[model samples]
Target chain A: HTFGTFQDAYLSQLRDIYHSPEFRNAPRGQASRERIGAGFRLLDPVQRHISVPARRANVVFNFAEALWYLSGSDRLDFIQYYAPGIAAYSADGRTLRGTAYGPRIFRHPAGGVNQWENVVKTLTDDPDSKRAVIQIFDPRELAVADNIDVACTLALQFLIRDGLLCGIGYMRANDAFRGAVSDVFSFTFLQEFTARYLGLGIGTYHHVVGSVHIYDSDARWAERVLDARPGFPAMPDGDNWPHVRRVLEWEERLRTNAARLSADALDALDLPAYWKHVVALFEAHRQVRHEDTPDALLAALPEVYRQSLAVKWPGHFG
Target chain B: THTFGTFQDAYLSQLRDIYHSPEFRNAPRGQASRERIGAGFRLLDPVQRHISVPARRANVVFNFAEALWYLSGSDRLDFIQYYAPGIAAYSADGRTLRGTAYGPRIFRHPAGGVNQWENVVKTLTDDPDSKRAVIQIFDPRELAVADNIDVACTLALQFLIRDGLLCGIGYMRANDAFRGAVSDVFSFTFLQEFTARYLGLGIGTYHHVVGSVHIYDSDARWAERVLDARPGFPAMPDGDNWPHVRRVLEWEERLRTNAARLSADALDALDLPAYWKHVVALFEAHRQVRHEDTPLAALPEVYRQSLAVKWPGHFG
Candidate 1:
């Protein structure tokens, strides 16, 4: 709980909740993990973004998700093209419920609210306002399915406490290892970008959940995963929110140049080693998830990277 | 933390999440009780939702009477005036609350479209897993035009039938955690239980989702008392006990409605179920509060004890 880089905080939280008497003794749902989100994101407007180097968070999907949500497009085809396995969730294997933050944030499918621009103005126009919330769980979807692709969150309320802290309170219905990494990574990156949008600094990322849980599905490795968390890594100075544009640009470029990842390029690219390796580790997860790599390549993958992948794709290792 | 009664435990458990959250706030931090909270709860095991806070609950008289009023399918302001005369001020029509009449809106016909409540029951009867059970309350026209008339915070209600149990959820856009929550929870649980009984289904988890759940600065002391009194209670009966809730309403239907006109025979006929009798006594107490008369002076003394027995201060 050193509030380690984005990478480390989640690990410790996962461990803390697993061993806590509340989670162990209190019963979990028969089906769901019944999870909650209490994530404290310490994104540097300039440098530190929620990244844990040990597991090298998935930078590719993270950036793509942030960009997709910001762009407000809900084409699963667009996402599946990048993330690869996402389209499998679609029952039709063609269209989707399009309940992600993308559609609701950019332009609500219901044809009313644009939460993204609203947040933009609510922050730029008035910084200390808590009324700037992004409602994602459209009641319109409840009519669709008891378990629809209704956004996992009900709403996200943003507050810019004069400290330049761009705290985003994420209210979620459920959370698991599947999206937790990317969820935090991209969300804080948005916080960084949003801070720069408002001429403020990245403060803390605040996340709250209805039931933050680890499903019985992942209940087996819940212990080992908890044990994997190491002590804190000394964090760097805050990133200037303006660099978010540069960070996003490099993030886009990282995908293009990663196979030929040049560690020496950090000096010229102005990217931190942690970020570079974090991006590299995401590619490692992709390879493991796709099972396209030889055991040698898989073995050579960062143990941290593999562990995160284990949480994401437990079926593979199990 | 002994799990006081069933509903009590669930209510305390819910209060726990909002109280313990890192997002806890006291002042009106911009948008409405919005500790700006987003919560999800399930009432699967026949024990959830209706919480009666000790010392100062949100008037069980109003809760039960208003629910029976809502079930009677009357949107007319006169009905509400019986329990809470001041509630009539909220009626847009002066005659009735066309917009806020949850029962009439659900059971009565809108200008068009099917009756939502009947459709809900039919949907469940036809297919238990159907998700088309939503009853619309928050209309798009509220945003489109300038009428400015709005109802309570409930956006919509969606009920689910699973494992032979009917579960319902009330989605509220804004909520006064201290005053509004009790009545809201009671009325909605009554709705869910009523629906379940009609469909011959068991009672399931009654869920609540509040968008801006908060206690205003004025009511902060009341909320503090609730949290303080949280520990010393046993598992009290929740609305999930379908037989208890059903019998109360059934007996209520037969009992004399006029409080001042009731005879000793009327009280005897009320020979109500234990819990039902407790509620009526509280109802009688509330009647005295409304008339500004001596509280519970007319309660035939037999039914008078249930009033001060469990919550003595509440009677005061």
Candidate 2:
């Protein structure tokens, strides 16, 4: 499928894999409710930052979660601040087990090597290298009786070629609804991080899923999301993505502004149009939820953007 | 695609990815051809198109025997010698191996009390949607020694039961595309199909993940042969599949149970198909080769008829 936007690609994939008249009684997952396991590749991943409005695909939380993983944090409280349900898989109630990709990406529990730094130096020194791999799953945590979550993803390998980097994420098991959305969001976002950090362009993103599926509970909503709306335009590609400098600033700004409960705070920032709107959306939502009253900052959004948010979340956006 | 023709497509994709541009790696010492470090692909039907090239694909003779050797939990060098003689090189002494072969590593491990391979089937049948169904063949303790145990340094394997069918996928740290690729994939998928068939579940995809793929300089000539037959559409069928597959298992077991004496009278009782008579021929030849006074070809034509196809070079 030739997708014009990220939303174009995302929804099309959901429809193809989830629902269609042909596969309603397809031979696939257990109880015959889920469809067959499938995998799709994104040739233009970094440039197409797909955020769904009807289902409220949060752009703010997407980047926020990426930053959380990159920081090597296992603290549930930190992720719960951005996404409250992130703690659902935590075993110890305090720290996440191996499933937290961030901690394993930067600091592999098995060895002393820092995967992220090793990848950067290797790609920088040799652009046409295939050895740039980050081990996301550790073999040691398998038999741990108290283990809360085992990382579904095994590893991420960066293939630097054509003056660009292609990020490959390998998952032995994947939950299509809850896990894949953030997985695609963060993995491709991580690809952009590498491309910008090394002064290259975004190429393709290949996600190999052994068992990509939807649980029985979310089958109804999954169908709704597939036929929800026309494709939303993908965010800017390549050079338009927020650079490292701006992202670091936003990470700090998000911490302070999110707690301060401010709105319209991101409108003045000198960043790409998409990222600026993302911050503006988060700030606007925060202001209305915490203060318990009307805030003019919420109105600062574009007419279409404000109404779209309202339609997606009527309880708050209205 | 429901994939009456998918594994054939997926294997060729890997062939193109590794043989074509973008995936080629720097030539290493003692090589046949350049390699792609990490290659990934999804097989709509893993068992189909198992043979990348026609007629002269990678050594099927070695592949089948090794898979049988692994599953039987026989660490004896003699068992593998009947098929793969090169495995002896991995052994420190000519006597025993480091126990990295699938037999000892999967069915019976020294370090763990559980039969890791059987547990995978248990976990899947017990709870089909369970993501915890995994079997790890790679042992971490081997790194402490200066020399490693085996060449098949796999990370782990997992099975997902979808639509009441069982599917398995394995992760390898590295692979020699020319030498080990065919056998590794075949053996793993064979095990996958065995598990599914035994449990009365249908077979699904057999995904193979490689971290570093290479073609040694010695394998350069062989790589050309592999890339020669890259035809399209329904590459080839793995087999007729199902209802008839348990026969393959029964024959293999019959060969094992009657290893000491495989007579023509016994062959008639087993009543395996004429296509499998090659197995019986190989068994008779295996016994004749050790007589010392006689050569493999000197055996009677009745004893050696199927060996011509099963072990083509033996008679020629």
Candidate 3:
């Protein structure tokens, strides 16, 4: 059945579900082996803390796993090689719903390193009626994380649909390579199932991240993609051409086999529709040449499709 | 030279002479005895009383009589006949001495009245050292005199032999006839001496008379003479001409005649030198001529000479 109301309403409902007691009381072992899985390369133990509530435990497991899986072969080696052990089968014979990980600490590596905790209060306060927040990457924590400039915490959220908790998402993330890939995969999975079983507007997938650092080593690639078009002109009226071109170039880069492999690893346990929507969003955002379709009609797109289209065609069209 | 037992005796003897002599008793009549003698005597009495006082007696009498006649009479002779005896006495006395008279108990005929007052000018000038002189004619008890006709008294002054020039002055207690014949007659001798001393550098005689000297009647003739003599009168190239003796004498004659007539011309000549000399002399002596002073010792020589002519027969 088609869901009624806007995506925002569905998202708020999913938020309430993720916070419920039944979901929060699941056993750690069962939750980790069944509906949730261990992830997160930075986590000391590559196991999920499943003794907590199912909702909280599942969210933590999904977020960590997603982060671990998306790590490239070089950085994700530990989780990528041990993927089978971390995989979780769906309970109730249905796909898992959304998940979230957390309000973790971050610090900068430099002498003027900031502790994320100090700025956490600013992030947590509701800027608007809805409270979705992510903390800044702290310079001090960067040293603890191998001098990573993009130190961040990860979170995931999930939603149940058609008698199954099928969606998953990530939040409170920072950096590009590890956290960004993981978050994208998590949200794509959530969008896929929600569209498939519960139909459009049945649930919402959200990802909130900050300090998504693009490393100096990655600057060449980033420039190639980000500065693809004529750059922004001066002042009051901002330039969107470069941004549009950058999105297109990033979509092109993501389509490479190597990029796809990293993307796939992040969402290896995700539903089929989830993967389709995620890829579709990427293709639409960058207007990438899809081997299956020569042209996509924007007006006919679904919510996920529209969001993907808006990423490329920013401004009034969005 | 008449000697007497006391000052009062000398005074009474002189008075008897003035009372009985032809000059006093046979004085001409004008405008009837009742109007001339009765009114004139009555006027003269108070004037004399003002002059008899020791301090400003001569001045008071001279100023009072001159201002009175300037307001009375119809012709020059009437003023001369009434004013001659006092003028003569003042001119003869000189400044170092004083003349006193008692009375003319009855009037006489052929007395030239104020015209004879001019004759006394010779008497005072004839004396070389008679500088500060006086005359007295005002009687003290004539209380019925009209205020309108009363000449306020003045103190007389005359400077003799200053740089060998005989100067005369009449100072009065009050000088009501400021713009009249009394002022003109008073200034004549002073102007003559001042001119002779400054211009001629020679010893020149001077005379002064005071009291009333009304001269409205002869104003036209006086103005004409002043105009005619305008050139000859001694003056700085651009200064006043009236200070010359000749101009002063001419002006004095006109003013005296005008006062005797009390004619409208005299009134018309109210601001002329012949009329205003008293005011000028008073102003010159003190450097300030107040309106009240104008009626009193405002004119120094005018008052002194009038007194000299009235009682001392010496021109001051």
Candidate 4:
């Protein structure tokens, strides 16, 4: 299946799994359905955001996780702040051994191989080589039965075909409704980063999963998501490290309530529209979660984000 | 898009695509002259894992031998060389092991003394619907140097037990349509089959995805001229196959070294089930094919057909 954005793919696959799931089984005694060997492709990876009003995806968490992966962090402290629910996946309660792909891709424990640099150099050196793959699932994950932190993702392969940096992300399993939304968002972000790093155009992003499922918990949410529709702008190209760092620094401050940013203050930050939009989302989240009215900040955002933000926080907006 | 029931249908469907399907565009390797079909997928039934195309002349004996080698966690060239001597070319050390050896990577990876086969079984046993049961094959460190001849083409293999069936999904960064893909399906699905039996579950479907799947320029004719044959429904060994697998490996060593000459009568006389005895029979057939001139007509029909077709001159 191919779609222009993740929102379309998500809706399409959700309907497929809901209507014609290959298997209906209860895993760990939780009633759920799955489509084994589920896969799809995203044509425009930069337009990775899922803005369905009914779904109410947390763009703040999505952005934070993408940066967290880029920062090479596996600590539960940073990720759990944005997503308190993710703490359950942590085996030891402090570290995320498998859920965190940052250390796996950037600071690999197997001989300390940095796959990010390796992919860049590989495509740069041999543009047509099919050997560029970043392995994320550690075989060591199967060490303990109680350890629930095994990586959902297996590997990320980058191929420069027809001069476009196409990315293929392989997963052992994926929660199509919730996990796929963030997984595609972050994966495409990394794909775009690699394309820019290689000085090439962004190609399609292919997500192949061993099992793509919808849990009983998220079944209702999936129906609503299927009923809704959505889209967003393409990310700007070039070295996004400094901009990412700036946004991450601000995210830390806002996450801790160390600082507050009004619409005017965010405007004063002098960030590009792409990055400023991320910071603006963070600020809006901070306001909404803390009981502050985001009416002014909502007006400050681009019409696209403003519309989604209003949907995300209906009572607080309009 | 999907083929069920037999390996013959699976191989024919894929080969036809390579020669005729417009979806397969010519994407040549960077400096090399060979062309490839980029991005291909084959969804197969786990039960039909064997490649029995008469014209393709797939090495059925070698397929099982290699699978046994991977199961035994042996990367040594001596164990595999008897089956496919060409495999020695991929061995970096030339005498002992290949960098692309899937045995050690699957059974025993260097990280933390982890055995993925056991881990996956434990994972599935713990949570039947768990998607976390992944076996990683490609290590990112393999690409750090950029000058290795035998980096693992397979990225990972994931197993999922849903609706009481153990499904296998294989992800490959690169797969040669003519050569690698056929043998890979056999081995990966075999691994899937054993794991399912190990967990006391039934066999399921197998899905294979290749990022850059291609038929090489040299092997294009072989891909084109491939003949289709009816697939046989072969049974898998049952009841905790660890001992059976170990016994097969032991027989493999004995046969490969010409340490023992086991006739069909001798094979039937061994204290093993007929299913396992057949695997031993294939190895024995291989030994005869390699060392002596013996008529293989008494072997099982499927085994005899594969051996006869693959080696028409030797068999006749």
Candidate 5:
């Protein structure tokens, strides 16, 4: 399946898995259904957000998660704040092993290869090299059974052809309802970031899954997403490492509740508008979590994000 | 972008329009030149892995030998030299093995001791619907230096068991449409079958996703002349036949080295399942082709016929 927007693919796939699953099985007795070898392509990867009202997509959390991946922190403290439910999947209450693709992508093992740096050099030298892959699935994960957070993704490949950086995400299994939106959001965001880093246009994003499924527990929510007929809907610098650090600092401060950034202070930071939006998201999350009103930062966000926030937190935004 | 049915369909679809696309180019890298297509291609039914076209004349003996070699988790130069001596050129050192040898990487990680194949089997076994059942073959450390000759072209292999069928997807960084794709497909699908058989699941479809598929300028004319190429079920036994892979490997070593001479009758009497026995017969047949002048009619009929297509009158 191919679509210009992730929303279309998300809804269509949810409906497909709900209505037309090939078989039903419960791995570890967790009842679910699946369609094997499922794949889809997003022609314009920038429109990766899901904006349907009924679905309640969290763009703020999505931004924080992408930054979390870029920061390369597997610590549960940061992500648990955004999506507290993630804590249940954590084997150690402190960190996430398989689900934290950051450690693998940015810093794998103890001073092993850094896939992000290596792939960048690879494409810069030979844009045509098919070897630009960042492996996420560690076989060591399976060595320990009862590990709840084994990585769903296998690897991410970037292809620079005709000046457009196209990305492919390979997964061994994905929960179509719960995983698709967040997974696509982060993967495509990384793709777009890499394209910006390479000074190339964003091409297409292909997601190839060994098994794409929907669990029975999420069936009602999946149907609700389909029940609401809807339609949907960046990084800075050539060497953006320093900027990423600053953004992470801002996120860390906000997430830990150690500091607060007013709109003026956020605008005062030396960062691109693309990254400033990230600081804004962090601020918005901070305000919503702790304060009675999030209007200052919410009103300051760009129109697209403002709309997403309106749909995401209708009570507050209204 | 997608071809189904057989390796024949994949080959024809690959070569038929390979030169027709505007994306095709004469790309020269380091020393070798290729008529490259930047676009990707997919093989839907990798179970039909054999290329039957006589023009292609794919060496099934070498194919089976290479598959067994990979499964054996060996990176030894001597074993593969008996089958594909031409691969020696890619060996970083002339005597040891190719840096790109997927066996070591698949069975043992370059950084440490890890058998990824068993890891994948464990993943699929514990969670049949797991998308994390991936066997990574390519390592980024291979690209850490510029002088290395043999970087693994395969990025990874993923297994998914859906609907009681173990489907496999092979992701390649690059593939030679003429030479490498056929052999790669055969080896990968064979591994998939082995995995499926290990897990006691039926074999399902296989997907080969190639990032850059090309026919070298040297092989372009050959690919043009041979612009064409399945015949069967997976030849896999039902349930927990993974132990047989070791048995077949044992025969492979014996037959490859000719330490013990075995006729078809003797091979038939081995205490192994029919599926494994056939694989041993393939090894025995390869030994005959390499060392003996005896006719291969003594082998099984289907084996003789398949080899006949590859070797023509020699097998008959």
Candidate 6:
């Protein structure tokens, strides 16, 4: 796919694949789907040229949305202009799916608005908009709730750029170790959907769970993943397709390795190292950008991949 | 006929004669006569010897039959004991004189000792004898008659001593400034009498008359008399007749002079020096005595005399 014309189509196709039932039913998707719901995949490969790990895409979109809000250039106008995906998500998520969008603005039963009011007031003027808020978690629906153990969990923001999508997910969250994976998946999927509707390039994503908790339950799983991977580098810049590609290839290898590992092998692996590599990769490329020429971009690719390439990449290559 | 080489020897011989006189026992007759003789001789006996001069004497008398009460060391023994006489005087015109001859015994009253006066008398009679024994209820407490009119005297005692005699003579009923000659004459007589009685013992004598026995009305007249007397008495030598009293009185005069010569601030500055000198003289005089000698009374005559001089005149 070319940079300008094909990026949007590629992003839509990527969203479809991510929401596809066959993909959602896959082994990797099954874990998150069971925890969250169906129609949630773990990866978003928008085009042969641009792909982002689902978690990273979510982090990027969230980061962009947060930046847009922080910029404070009129809420609706800014969101419509700078963060169309976020505005769309706010509108669509509240209306069509009945999903709360922002931090829940709760009022004391007697009177008095809370901090959530500030957050929501800053996001949109819609009095009825869910704003992705959660005031009271239903104990009855807890076991089956899409956000069962979620606490202070809220959709912070969403954004789309070119054919890549990103989001900032905040879970007034606890248990950084266990909730992180699911949290990243949920917000990335949210961003993926936003990106699909906007027909934008699936770029970098971001997830900033304000308080990341490391619970005892996820220690072993983390250790195993960390042990198999190189120490995590920074995230790929939204503009840098090659860096994103490298991260995608790395995560793909990790998934393949995870699939092949026997329970004993997984147990024996250094999980901390595996998880460290994943976190590092996300951090490194968090702000990277693409060079402008297709030759330069193609040259930037690994020689084996460049030789194997069917088409020239959009950005510069040597 | 007189076994004397000089006038000093004659005076010493005469003093010894009076001190050992048995006739001195007779209160008004022989005692009085002996006192007169002693005073007469002391005034004229040109003695350059180191003779002990008797200064002023403090006499407090208890009533008849209350003599035993005075003798008894019973009522407020602290006061009686504090100012007890160190030396006894028998000659008349002495500082101390009691009517009854009781060797320091407590007096007892009649009427079954039911009334306060009688009870006081009885309590007095009940006490023991000592040289310190004496009583005089001077302060007015007549209202407690039922309790004991005689007991009304908070301190009942007669005190007579031989060192640093301070006599302040004020007119009983005369106008202040106009009564100069009379006050001086009275104070001088009192001093002479006291000196005679004390000198009869052949001991030393010192006399300090505060206010110099004068009132404000008599100030000019008193000043005239003082001027007359200034040259009359030669500078009495130290340890001769009334040396301590003389020295203290002289020191007091010096202070008056300094105060007059300097400003108020300067005089105030010298207050410490004045205080120290006075305190030292008092200590020297009263160090050995026991009862009937009020320690407060033992303060130097200079301090009291200086105070008297400072007031009314220098005060302005």
Model 4 stretches astray by more than 4 angstroms: A91-93, A229-231, A262-265, A268-270, A290-297, B22-44, B227-233, B292-295
For candidate 4, write residues A1-318 as lDDT tens digits. 778877778888999999899888776676777887778888888878776678877677887899899989998988898889999998788889888999999988777889888888777777887878888888776776667677888889888777688898988788888889899989998998888777789888898887788998888877877766335656667777888788889988887778888778888896787888788888887887777665477776666677766777777664
lDDT of 3 by residue, A1-318 (tens): 012222222223233323321121111111110101111211111111112111111222233344332221122222322233322322222221111121131222112222222222212221110111112222122112122122233222232222222222222223342234444443443233223323222232333221123334443543333223111111111222243333333333544422432334323423233233333344332233223332334443344335434443444225
Model 4, residue B259: what's the lDDT?
Answer: 92
lDDT (Cα, tens digit) per residue for candidate 2, span B217-264 = 666666566566533212112343333334544555444444455555
- Model 5 clash pairs? A172-B131, A173-B131, B8-B229
| Model 6 residue A46 CA deviation in Å | 6.8
lDDT of 3 by residue, B34-92 (tens): 00010000011111112122222234333333433332322233333333433433323
lDDT winner among the candidates? 4
lDDT of 4: 0.78
lDDT of each model, Cα atoms only? 0.53, 0.59, 0.27, 0.78, 0.76, 0.26
Candidate 5 chain B lDDT trough over 10 residues, lowest sum: B30-39
TM-scores of the candidates are 0.59, 0.69, 0.17, 0.93, 0.89, 0.17
Runs with alpha carbons beyond 4 Å of true place in candidate 3: A1-146, A154-163, A166-280, A286-300, A307-318, B1-316
Residue A272's lDDT in candidate 6: 38
When superposed on Cα atoms, how far off is each prediction in RMSD?
8.7, 7.5, 58.8, 2.7, 3.4, 48.9
DockQ of each: 0.09, 0.14, 0.00, 0.63, 0.45, 0.00
Docking class of 1: incorrect
Flag the better candidate by TM-score, 2 or 3: 2
lDDT of 2: 0.59
Residues B91-197, candidate 4, lDDT per residue (tens digit)?
Answer: 87766664557888887786665788878887777777776777888876788754777788888888887667788888888777678877898899888888888
Which portion of correct inter-chain contacts appears in model 1? Answer: 0.02
- For residue A271, model 5's alpha carbon misses the true position, in angstroms, by 2.1
Docking class of 4: medium
How far residue B272's Cα lies from its native spot in candidate 3, in Å, is 99
* B1-316 per-residue lDDT for model 1 (tens digits): 1123345555666565555552555343343342534443444443333454544544445666877776666777766766666777677767887545676656553424336677666556666654446665543223322333444356557676655667666766556666676677767876776677677677766666654566565655666677888222112233334455555555444332544523434544665554455565555555444545553554433234334544355563
Per-residue error (Å), model 3, residue B255: 99
